[PDB]
Design an enzyme around this catalytic site. Structure first.
Site, PDB file in Angstrom:
ATOM      1  N   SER A  18      46.123  38.191   8.778  1.00 20.88           N
ATOM      2  CA  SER A  18      47.381  37.770   9.400  1.00 20.88           C
ATOM      3  C   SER A  18      47.424  38.117  10.891  1.00 20.88           C
ATOM      4  O   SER A  18      47.836  37.280  11.702  1.00 20.88           O
ATOM      5  CB  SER A  18      48.566  38.427   8.696  1.00 20.88           C
ATOM      6  OG  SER A  18      48.617  38.061   7.326  1.00 20.88           O
ATOM      7  N   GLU A  21      40.914  39.491  12.562  1.00 18.36           N
ATOM      8  CA  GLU A  21      39.736  39.283  11.713  1.00 18.36           C
ATOM      9  C   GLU A  21      39.434  40.520  10.884  1.00 18.36           C
ATOM     10  O   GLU A  21      39.672  41.640  11.339  1.00 18.36           O
ATOM     11  CB  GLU A  21      38.506  38.917  12.559  1.00 18.36           C
ATOM     12  N   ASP A 131      55.825  40.188   4.501  1.00 20.88           N
ATOM     13  CA  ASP A 131      54.967  39.003   4.460  1.00 20.88           C
ATOM     14  C   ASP A 131      54.144  38.959   3.180  1.00 20.88           C
ATOM     15  O   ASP A 131      52.973  38.589   3.217  1.00 20.88           O
ATOM     16  CB  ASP A 131      54.042  39.003   5.681  1.00 20.88           C
ATOM     17  CG  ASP A 131      54.788  39.028   6.991  1.00 20.88           C
ATOM     18  OD1 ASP A 131      55.719  38.211   7.158  1.00 20.88           O
ATOM     19  OD2 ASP A 131      54.419  39.834   7.866  1.00 20.88           O
ATOM     20  N   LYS A 133      52.559  37.478   0.042  1.00 25.68           N
ATOM     21  CA  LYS A 133      52.160  36.128  -0.365  1.00 25.68           C
ATOM     22  C   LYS A 133      50.878  36.221  -1.208  1.00 25.68           C
ATOM     23  O   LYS A 133      50.214  37.259  -1.184  1.00 25.68           O
ATOM     24  CB  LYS A 133      51.951  35.229   0.878  1.00 25.68           C
ATOM     25  CG  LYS A 133      51.078  35.852   1.960  1.00 25.68           C
ATOM     26  CD  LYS A 133      51.044  35.014   3.227  1.00 25.68           C
ATOM     27  CE  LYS A 133      50.482  35.782   4.401  1.00 25.68           C
ATOM     28  NZ  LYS A 133      49.705  34.906   5.320  1.00 25.68           N
ATOM     29  N   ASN A 136      47.717  37.896   0.106  1.00 27.31           N
ATOM     30  CA  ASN A 136      47.706  39.356   0.217  1.00 27.31           C
ATOM     31  C   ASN A 136      47.534  40.062  -1.147  1.00 27.31           C
ATOM     32  O   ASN A 136      47.603  41.285  -1.191  1.00 27.31           O
ATOM     33  CB  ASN A 136      48.984  39.864   0.892  1.00 27.31           C
ATOM     34  CG  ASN A 136      49.187  39.399   2.318  1.00 27.31           C
ATOM     35  OD1 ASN A 136      50.296  39.078   2.717  1.00 27.31           O
ATOM     36  ND2 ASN A 136      48.154  39.425   3.155  1.00 27.31           N
ATOM     37  N   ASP A 152      47.941  44.711   3.622  1.00 25.58           N
ATOM     38  CA  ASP A 152      48.822  44.595   4.798  1.00 25.58           C
ATOM     39  C   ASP A 152      50.246  45.140   4.563  1.00 25.58           C
ATOM     40  O   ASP A 152      51.168  44.710   5.249  1.00 25.58           O
ATOM     41  CB  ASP A 152      48.918  43.133   5.290  1.00 25.58           C
ATOM     42  CG  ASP A 152      47.589  42.541   5.695  1.00 25.58           C
ATOM     43  OD1 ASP A 152      46.713  43.307   6.139  1.00 25.58           O
ATOM     44  OD2 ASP A 152      47.459  41.299   5.659  1.00 25.58           O
ATOM     45  N   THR A 171      53.115  30.560   4.600  1.00 24.78           N
ATOM     46  CA  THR A 171      54.014  31.710   4.817  1.00 24.78           C
ATOM     47  C   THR A 171      55.458  31.337   4.482  1.00 24.78           C
ATOM     48  O   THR A 171      56.171  32.146   3.891  1.00 24.78           O
ATOM     49  CB  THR A 171      53.946  32.222   6.264  1.00 24.78           C
ATOM     50  OG1 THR A 171      54.360  31.179   7.151  1.00 24.78           O
ATOM     51  CG2 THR A 171      52.565  32.720   6.644  1.00 24.78           C
TER      52      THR A 171
HETATM   53  N1  LIG Z   1      45.946  47.831   5.167  1.00 22.67           N
HETATM   54  C1  LIG Z   1      44.795  47.432   5.989  1.00 22.67           C
HETATM   55  C2  LIG Z   1      44.817  45.928   6.255  1.00 22.67           C
HETATM   56  N2  LIG Z   1      43.443  45.401   6.290  1.00 22.67           N
HETATM   57  C3  LIG Z   1      43.072  44.290   5.651  1.00 22.67           C
HETATM   58  C4  LIG Z   1      42.062  44.341   4.679  1.00 22.67           C
HETATM   59  C5  LIG Z   1      41.680  43.179   3.990  1.00 22.67           C
HETATM   60  C6  LIG Z   1      40.676  43.188   3.012  1.00 22.67           C
HETATM   61  C7  LIG Z   1      40.597  44.195   2.044  1.00 22.67           C
HETATM   62  C8  LIG Z   1      39.575  44.133   1.098  1.00 22.67           C
HETATM   63  N3  LIG Z   1      38.673  43.047   1.125  1.00 22.67           N
HETATM   64  C9  LIG Z   1      38.809  42.081   2.058  1.00 22.67           C
HETATM   65  N4  LIG Z   1      37.942  41.057   2.099  1.00 22.67           N
HETATM   66  C10 LIG Z   1      38.420  39.803   2.146  1.00 22.67           C
HETATM   67  C11 LIG Z   1      38.859  39.245   3.360  1.00 22.67           C
HETATM   68  C12 LIG Z   1      39.348  37.937   3.405  1.00 22.67           C
HETATM   69  C13 LIG Z   1      39.367  37.164   2.240  1.00 22.67           C
HETATM   70  C14 LIG Z   1      38.912  37.705   1.034  1.00 22.67           C
HETATM   71 CL1  LIG Z   1      38.942  36.747  -0.391  1.00 22.67          CL
HETATM   72  C15 LIG Z   1      38.431  39.019   0.987  1.00 22.67           C
HETATM   73  N5  LIG Z   1      39.786  42.175   2.986  1.00 22.67           N
HETATM   74  C16 LIG Z   1      42.260  41.959   4.345  1.00 22.67           C
HETATM   75  C17 LIG Z   1      43.235  41.916   5.336  1.00 22.67           C
HETATM   76  N6  LIG Z   1      43.629  43.106   5.982  1.00 22.67           N
END
Ligand SMILES: NCCNc1cc(-c2ccnc(Nc3cccc(Cl)c3)n2)ccn1
Ligand SMILES: [Ca+2]
Length: 447
Positions: A18, A21, A131, A133, A136, A152, A171
């Site tokens: 969100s 990257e 947020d 959804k 998340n 998040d 969203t």
């Molecule tokens: N609370 C800390 C926020 N960090 C966070 C961590 C993750 C996050 C956490 C665990 N795994 C993945 N891998 C992942 C990423 C995008 C799509 C998919 Cl299907 C998997 N991302 C995603 C978004 N934000």
């Protein structure tokens, strides 16, 4: 202050979040894998001051619940914030539901019981998501039935949401009405969960429209119905919980704690399969993913064109002879200058740049040929995602998508109807193939 790059090294790009990257990183000592969300300070403004952000971070690092993503560390440099947490490989909740053949109220109740457990716990600690959804809701492991982890939690309070449509896809369906008018509290997360529960049992959003603004109008009015054939095979307790969760006035809306004690959660966690709902979630997930892939394809085409002329101008200034050729060490100096101008790409350190340039140097010396390969490594990743998303959307394998399906896709992507219809006539019988669809997206971004 500790440096991020000195402790972690970037392995692979997990995806786009969100506020930034998400990168798979590995500790340089212990070898522990971690998912790091990189928030760019220029692309994301801070709603709160520095000391309020550090206090929430400190609190979030001490919280622990099986349905909440664990935040391990937090780093900050001149232009970025790094949120280091645990890795989950099970994928998004809805991607797993479209793959299985059977899905019942027992599976829906087992999902929402986990989401409500995590929410109840975070609400007791004064943390609001806002947020929430399906994107998340991540599955902890790669299984048919797995543990759900919410990602998040608490970021929305400290970071401004993006105005770019590529970051706003899907969203509007889940946002609570009170969030739109300014006065909201933790009850906005019960509404969002109520919307997800409605989609699990029917496959159709309760507040829907042909574009973002039409959806927000429906959400704001707050009116919805259980007047679809698929709702006839659903229990009255499931409908009752949704009515209590989608109550307009937040003080009258049920709490996340009381939602766990509801008869539907108590009865179905301690039944017919909803086939119509699976088909509609498949169609819904496929439509959302093609709209995002289309927007990311157009964005990557503009980004590559910006970087193509910028990297060509950097290599031209370094070329003293004027023959158009450069050494391998010179190409690295020019590539490092590109990241020095636009900022560190989520390419974490100098070691990742030398290997990224070596990968291009092995494939491709004239710097014109190097520019094409170096830039095509970013565009072909988004083009493969576009074709793959088109193929997935094209569920009957006809090779085409109808004019009605384009209107739905461009509706979710927020491309005005008169603009895409005109662009179709320039490239091209009420349907388009993949190349024609790609040609429309290219014409919709000045190409
Ligand atoms: N609370 C800390 C926020 N960090 C966070 C961590 C993750 C996050 C956490 C665990 N795994 C993945 N891998 C992942 C990423 C995008 C799509 C998919 Cl299907 C998997 N991302 C995603 C978004 N934000
Ligand atoms: Ca088709």
């Amino acid at each position: 202050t500790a440096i991020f790059s000195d402790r972690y090294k970037g392995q692979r790009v997990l995806g786009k979040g969100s506020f930034g990257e998400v990168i798979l990183c590995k500790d340089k000592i212990t070898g522990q894998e971690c998912a790091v969300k990189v928030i760019s300070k220029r692309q994301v403004k801070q709603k709160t001051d520095k000391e309020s952000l550090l206090r929430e971070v400190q609190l979030l690092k001490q919280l622990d619940h099986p349905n909440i993503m664990k935040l391990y560390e937090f780093f900050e440099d001149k232009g970025y914030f790094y949120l280091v947490g645990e890795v989950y490989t099970g994928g998004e909740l809805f991607d797993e539901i479209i793959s299985r053949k059977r899905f019942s109220e027992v599976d829906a109740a087992r999902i929402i019981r986990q989401v409500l457990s995590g929410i109840t716990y975070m609400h007791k600690n004064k943390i609001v998501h806002r947020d929430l959804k399906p994107e998340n809701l991540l599955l902890e492991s790669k299984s048919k039935d797995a543990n759900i982890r919410i990602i998040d939690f608490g970021l929305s309070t400290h970071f401004e949401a993006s105005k770019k449509m590529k970051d706003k896809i899907g969203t509007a369906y889940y946002i609570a009405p009170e969030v739109l008018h300014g006065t909201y509290d933790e009850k906005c997360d019960v509404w969002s969960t109520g919307v997800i529960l409605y989609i699990l049992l029917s496959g159709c959003p309760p507040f829907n429209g042909a574009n973002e603004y039409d959806i927000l109008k429906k959400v704001e009015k707050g009116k919805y119905t259980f007047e679809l054939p698929q709702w006839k095979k659903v229990s009255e307790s499931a409908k009752d919980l949704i009515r209590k969760m989608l109550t307009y006035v937040p003080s009258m809306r049920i709490s996340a704690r009381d939602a766990l004690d509801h008869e539907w959660i108590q009865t179905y966690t301690k039944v017919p399969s909803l086939d119509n709902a699976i088909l509609n979630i498949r169609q819904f997930q496929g439509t959302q993913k093609l709209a995002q892939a289309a927007l990311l394809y157009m964005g990557s085409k503009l980004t590559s064109q910006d970087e193509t002329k910028e990297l060509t101008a950097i290599f031209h200034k370094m070329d003293k002879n004027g023959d158009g050729q450069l050494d391998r060490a010179e190409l690295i100096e020019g590539y490092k200058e590109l990241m020095r101008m636009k900022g560190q790409d989520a390419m974490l350190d100098a070691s990742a740049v030398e290997h990224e340039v070596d990968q291009v140097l092995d494939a491709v010396i004239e710097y014109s040929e190097f520019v094409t390969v170096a830039m095509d490594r970013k565009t072909l990743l988004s083009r493969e995602r576009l074709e793959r998303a088109f193929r997935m959307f094209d569920s009957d394998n006809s090779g085409k998508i109808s004019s009605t399906e384009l209107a739905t896709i461009f509706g979710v992507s927020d491309v005005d109807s008169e603009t895409w219809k005109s662009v179709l006539s320039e490239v091209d019988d009420g349907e388009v193939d993949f190349d024609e669809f790609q040609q429309m997206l290219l014409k919709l971004c000045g190409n």
